[PDB]
Design a protein around this ligand. Sequence first.
Ligand SMILES: CC(=O)N[C@@H]1[C@@H](O)[C@H](O[C@@H]2O[C@H](CO[C@]3(C(=O)O)C[C@H](O)[C@@H](NC(C)=O)[C@H]([C@H](O)[C@H](O)CO)O3)[C@H](O)[C@H](O)[C@H]2O)[C@@H](CO)O[C@H]1O
Ligand SMILES: CC(=O)N[C@H]1[C@H]([C@H](O)[C@H](O)CO)O[C@@](OC[C@H]2O[C@@H](O)[C@H](O)[C@@H](O)[C@H]2O)(C(=O)O)C[C@@H]1O
Ligand SMILES: *[C@@H]1O[C@H](CO)[C@@H](O[C@@H]2O[C@H](CO)[C@@H](O)[C@H](O)[C@H]2NC(C)=O)[C@H](O)[C@H]1NC(C)=O
Ligand SMILES: *[C@@H]1O[C@H](CO)[C@@H](O[C@@H]2O[C@H](CO)[C@@H](O)[C@H](O)[C@H]2NC(C)=O)[C@H](O)[C@H]1NC(C)=O
Ligand SMILES: *[C@@H]1O[C@H](CO)[C@@H](O)[C@H](O)[C@H]1NC(C)=O
Ligand SMILES: *[C@@H]1O[C@H](CO)[C@@H](O)[C@H](O)[C@H]1NC(C)=O
Lengths: 318, 315, 316, 166, 168, 169
Amino acid sequence: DKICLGHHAVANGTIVKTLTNEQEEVTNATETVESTGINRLCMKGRKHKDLGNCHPIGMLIGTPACDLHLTGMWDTLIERENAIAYCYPGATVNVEALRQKIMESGGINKISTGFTYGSSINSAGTTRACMRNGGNSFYAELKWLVSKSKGQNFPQTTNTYRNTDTAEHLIMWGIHHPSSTQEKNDLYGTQSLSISVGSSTYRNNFVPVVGARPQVNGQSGRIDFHWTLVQPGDNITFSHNGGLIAPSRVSKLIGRGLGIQSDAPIDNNCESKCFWRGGSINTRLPFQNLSPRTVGQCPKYVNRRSLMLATGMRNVPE
Amino acid sequence: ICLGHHAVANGTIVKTLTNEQEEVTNATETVESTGINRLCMKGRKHKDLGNCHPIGMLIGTPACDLHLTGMWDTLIERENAIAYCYPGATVNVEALRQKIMESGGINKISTGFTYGSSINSAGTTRACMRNGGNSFYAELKWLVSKSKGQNFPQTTNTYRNTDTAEHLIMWGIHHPSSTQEKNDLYGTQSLSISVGSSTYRNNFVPVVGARPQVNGQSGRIDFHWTLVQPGDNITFSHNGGLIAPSRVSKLIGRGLGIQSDAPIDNNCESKCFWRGGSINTRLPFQNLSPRTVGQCPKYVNRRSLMLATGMRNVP
Amino acid sequence: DKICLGHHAVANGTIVKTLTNEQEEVTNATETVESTGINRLCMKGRKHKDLGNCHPIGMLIGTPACDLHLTGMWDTLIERENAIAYCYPGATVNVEALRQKIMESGGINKISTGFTYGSSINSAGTTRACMRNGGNSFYAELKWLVSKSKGQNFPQTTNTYRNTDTAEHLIMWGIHHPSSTQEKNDLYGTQSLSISVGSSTYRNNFVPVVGARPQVNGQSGRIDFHWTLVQPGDNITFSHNGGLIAPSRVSKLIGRGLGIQSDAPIDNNCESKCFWRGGSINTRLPFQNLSPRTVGQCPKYVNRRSLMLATMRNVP
Amino acid sequence: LFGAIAGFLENGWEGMVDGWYGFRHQNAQAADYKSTQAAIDQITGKLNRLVEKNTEFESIESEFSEIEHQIGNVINWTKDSITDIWTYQAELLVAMENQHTIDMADSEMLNLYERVRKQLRQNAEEDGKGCFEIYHACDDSCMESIRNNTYDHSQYREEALLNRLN
Amino acid sequence: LFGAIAGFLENGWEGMVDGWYFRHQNAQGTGQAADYKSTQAAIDQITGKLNRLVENTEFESIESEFSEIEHQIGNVINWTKDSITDIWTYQAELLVAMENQHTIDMADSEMLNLYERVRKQLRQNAEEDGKGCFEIYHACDDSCMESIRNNTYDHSQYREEALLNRLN
Amino acid sequence: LFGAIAGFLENGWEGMVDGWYGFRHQNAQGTGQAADYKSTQAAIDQITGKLNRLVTNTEFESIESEFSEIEHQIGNVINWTKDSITDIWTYQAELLVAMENQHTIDMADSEMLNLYERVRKQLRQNAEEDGKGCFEIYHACDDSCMESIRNNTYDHSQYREEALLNRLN
Ligand SMILES: CC(=O)N[C@@H]1[C@@H](O)[C@H](O[C@@H]2O[C@H](CO[C@]3(C(=O)O)C[C@H](O)[C@@H](NC(C)=O)[C@H]([C@H](O)[C@H](O)CO)O3)[C@H](O)[C@H](O)[C@H]2O)[C@@H](CO)O[C@H]1O
Ligand SMILES: CC(=O)N[C@H]1[C@H]([C@H](O)[C@H](O)CO)O[C@@](OC[C@H]2O[C@@H](O)[C@H](O)[C@@H](O)[C@H]2O)(C(=O)O)C[C@@H]1O
Ligand SMILES: *[C@@H]1O[C@H](CO)[C@@H](O[C@@H]2O[C@H](CO)[C@@H](O)[C@H](O)[C@H]2NC(C)=O)[C@H](O)[C@H]1NC(C)=O
Ligand SMILES: *[C@@H]1O[C@H](CO)[C@@H](O[C@@H]2O[C@H](CO)[C@@H](O)[C@H](O)[C@H]2NC(C)=O)[C@H](O)[C@H]1NC(C)=O
Ligand SMILES: *[C@@H]1O[C@H](CO)[C@@H](O)[C@H](O)[C@H]1NC(C)=O
Ligand SMILES: *[C@@H]1O[C@H](CO)[C@@H](O)[C@H](O)[C@H]1NC(C)=O
């Protein structure tokens, strides 16, 4: 005649780690690190734009690939691995800043510069390297100004964009660097070329430079892109002897949105807020070990396979 | 004989490792809040710049005449401080500004540059004004031909640092609004300004273009600066466009730099400051501002954290 | 009749730190913060490379002091305080980025550019500032090009290096800047000078400039260095009227390495994984006191001289 | 560490699936509710604290385009240090709260072994087993009277004293 | 963790002042007193915790408040500072939670300890009802209760007269 | 936290060196000192468990040149980052050490309380406790019976009668 006080035990218990003991068996535990994430991009609850093979810069300049992304609004902007920025070979100055600025946006609106040109200017210049449909073409937001009659000197020109908005506008132009000392003469004439640009907050000048270069996309020439932010009430003046690739329209970045770099397939059933290069992560758990590098509302990444949080007493039986 | 613990009618609650709602007899908070919105400059030999920008000290904009020289253990910059009376920009402006803001003092040493009689150094603008009249940067001179339209003569001026500490030398380049007002000021010459020391080599060409009027001025003056080591000399070989240095600046020691629009209370001490006011506390954590300066407590994203100073309360 | 229960104590008790009491006597305690360092560089089990007075840039351009370090294989590269990069007074654009790039390399290889020059060009220009074997010389991986006749105009010239490797290549060229007009006219002629570099992924235009400056190593001229990466199956082209310091060989940074800037001399019988400016660190402790700037797989730097850890309450 | 588990108790009962803490008895098995509830509420309290913890972050480093080398190795060093810190925070967290977990799971056993002790009072005696010895015939009603926590030591002292001293 | 405060002591007394941790009955009347040593022992530990709390390396500015900052580096700074803030926040919550758990549980301990010194002192002469009260089987004048608080109490003095009451 | 170490055991035994935890007795023959293995070993094992936890690699490269100068802005943005990391880690070190020490001391105290409890339950009725850590033994205990208690072999029942008759008179 007696009474026994005891604790319960399981058949198969799980091991955890403590202050004083490694390999401490416990009745139950739950992990605090998530090692599994969805391969797909989970975009439910988020109105988003997918760029595919369109690079963000392209939106601002009008690369054919970005035709269906010249304007738009979005919670979330997704960029892909080999997206095209340039049809005509070139580069952009401080490109990473600009690209980031675009991924930090929640939409783009475009606005005519209202630029008009002299009769001695051919403002419909095109190129084999920038194809729309089957036709020779060019960047949608830019015009390649050449002298209407081959070989004459390009006239001294002046175009001033005037901003009448309550927000700043991003403006982008280009500078042509020909391949042959002939090409130059056939486009802008033989005169010394020069392209000054200037607003209340920006001053710069661009000399075109003929040089022997390898052909990229069947072109030895090069267009280098330059961009600045034009404040409300601010005007910006272009003064050019020829060489200026000049903006037809101008870009207003609008709102705030989450930029994503990835190649994961989009999915519209799954909910998430934390994204990385392959797939997405949604988990109650505070910690994670998939990606060291992640975007948005994300669980802190730790370099461990597992961290079991014990959910009960010591496991000890017969 | 019976045993028992105390209790109170009304208890303060604390978060706990297992319980987020645990009633306790008393407690104290571990975060600071609603700190003093003012600038506590007790003991600190400070210097309020007002409308004068840091760089303005260097180039001597009129707003900064009271700040051309001096010493200080704390430098306060106000939001709408004027860097340039004459419209322009500075190359690597942030590095200069931060350099100045970690400085304990500025001393001016005259360059000694002298000019021939075909050169006019007394050039001024309405953009820069003292006594309600046209003036210029008090530490620079604007060089133009004495005979309007003529050619600026090729000129050489070498600042020689004969100190035992490095000096910071600033100069300006003038980019004219139009081809006219260029010829007028410097002539029909091709222009060039090459600067060279034992540690620095750069070339500058004044550029002509149309631009909107800032401060009623379509011209531009961009600024540049380099360090000249002890026993090192620096040479300016120029043709027209150079805004020459008449003096040169030496930063002396360190000094804490504060950015703030808040008023200076001279009768309180502090170790910590942000955009508005100062923070004074023993507490390790605060939530007034993510961006602080000085011997500050850590910033935390919580409106409150309660530390139980007492046992669990059971009424 | 008693049976009793008790614990041990000692005469000397170790004071430790707790949550509720700053100074609690305890039987025994140990340190968790290392304060002692080797004072040597432990390169055993590491293929290492002590540069001496060879700055990593010099391995690219071919500075005399770096004659022993023009090509190599290593897993650890050590730079020294007295390293030379420029025998002839000049500068390099993006110098720190490039140096860090070299310091992350696990080897360098050289490849000829195959550049040739017409008989209006002296390819073998030298200087006093770069001594090799006794006598005037110049950067082992570059050629200084001047008119063969002390007065004549340097000829318009075009040289193209084509990358036919499966790996990126790191090309370096220089751009001389004479002190005077006289000097200028003597080296390249009275004509207006211009250099231009061009590839698929790169495009630049350089122009020499005459100005008066002080003399460094008895030289008032300058040689400003510039560099770029050149992708496989691509051409890089130089078009110059003179003033171009042209590459004779290009560099290929191979692999990964650890880059250590240290005063300490090498011990090739030490094993180690954590280093700093003087010496290295071999400990089992998790924290460290020696230096806030260490490199490699090192314990973490704490701002505390001592942090003692109790190994019971010692009451006597 | 309290005495109860991995101490004077040598074993835990696999048979008990109904609760953490239980009663067994020879007579002529059950589990206590309140003790289990007390011991599980606190596992759910830091399960609750753990599951909900985050600031919005953006992509400073880029995936598809080479970044400037100096800013890139500064970003890599910063990230690597934040990762080390959070890994340490993590391991410390789980080790601390596992320690607390087990120590408590011990404490909630002993707290109500000390209930039973002080309820039986002088009507029973402490053993090496941890499984109390009753000297008087308690039916399933007496034993239920132990577990419900209403009872009367008074009603049995006169009886049990006679069994302890003869 | 420990048993007393939330386990078998079923509430706290408000009337108690200048003490964290005594009530009797006897015949003369009822008097209430608070034990000095246990409470000071707990309070000292709490003060130690606070002093540990209130015991800062200087920082310069890295963001320009009043002017442009280069986008990319500014983003780097925002990421870094928000990250550090996140870490420090987590540390703050962790410290406050564990400090609170330790505070409460340690105070509970400090009660239990007194309960056990008293039980080991009264020895045979008394009994446990399990609300932490002790049943005294031999009256006890106010001076005797005072002796219980004082720790001057000899157990063998009342042992026999008490044992007899225990048995009958 | 537990009554034993700083409470009802006022002092420790310096003379005893074999173990953290021990038995000392007086009987008609003499007085003897011995150590209880398991009680000490548990605590030693948890201590060395801690030390084992105290002692992996992540490889960092230099971001600060020491022989070349660094750009200013990035330079002290880096000074800022490194000072912040250093503050974090030093704070971590102090917190870790303090809390781990508190747990260590209260652990040893717990092990002592466990030994005391084991002995008390083992002795049962035959002995009584003064609040000094010792047990008043009211039946004469042979040294063989002394390390009968120490072994835990000890059977209370065999002496049960004698102490009882001694107890009530
Ligand atoms: C005609 C002659 O040789 N005269 C002797 C001088 O050489 C010598 O003076 C020093 O000249 C220095 C510059 O000399 C070089 C150099 O760097 O070594 C000579 C190089 O062959 C020349 N290389 C090329 C490719 O042109 C090089 C170059 O022109 C400049 O470096 C370009 O900036 O210059 C230097 O200016 C010294 O300061 C100067 O004293 C004197 C003294 O030994 O004796 C003369 O008879
Ligand atoms: C040194 C010098 O040449 N100072 C001139 C100055 C410069 O020529 C000019 O700023 C270079 O860009 O111009 C000043 O006049 C400018 C002023 O002239 C008014 O008449 C006009 O109506 C205004 O719109 C404005 O352009 C000047 O004050 O800066 C005169 C000064 O002497
Ligand atoms: C931008 O250009 C406009 C016009 O060229 C300038 O604004 C004008 O303001 C003046 C002064 O009141 C008026 O005389 C004109 O009629 C206005 N024109 C128009 C169409 O609005 C404006 O000052 C320039 N902005 C800057 C910053 O230079
Ligand atoms: C680099 O130079 C080589 C050689 O001029 C170029 O490749 C040649 O490739 C083209 C087409 O691919 C052939 O028609 C030639 O016969 C090749 N020449 C030899 C000798 O192999 C290559 O196109 C250049 N790289 C770039 C990117 O312009
Ligand atoms: C003192 O502590 C160290 C570290 O734990 C240990 O090696 C040593 O054995 C201890 N001293 C004694 C006498 O045990
Ligand atoms: C500086 O100038 C002085 C006088 O002209 C001269 O003695 C000295 O050599 C110059 N210093 C350098 C480094 O050229």
